[PDB]
Amino acid sequence: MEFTEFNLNELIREVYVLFEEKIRKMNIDFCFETDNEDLRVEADRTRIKQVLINLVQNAIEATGENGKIKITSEDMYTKVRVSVWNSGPPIPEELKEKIFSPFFTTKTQGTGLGLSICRKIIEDEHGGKIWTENRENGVVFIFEIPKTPEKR
């Protein structure tokens, strides 16, 4: 893996641009907010991009037509936190960790959830944490990564 310094918000916007047409076609209300425009991390940009694409794809599928997605990025002491929320039904308590298993596959609309690989990227490769919670009439997926491999 290749760690480089990059603006995390720039990467989030790059991923939004990938989905902009689909989001609009589906009439989804999307918003992105940050608490620090110059939020920079040292991480593997390609791999973090893969996690973002996977979470946004899942948010769109989950929220469906006329849905809502909100992304936030937050600058924490030795880490950053990215939260991707969608309006939709809550994840049942028994499935919260099972969705991250390489052998969760009770999921279609044509595609697997990809979350075991997201976990590998966030937790194994970057020493962070990724989890889900139910909130505000929807579901959030949150990841945190150390700002540098040295703050792991």
Ligand code: EMC
């Ligand atoms: C109402 C979706 Hg930022």
Ligand code: EMC
């Ligand atoms: C499908 C890579 Hg999180």
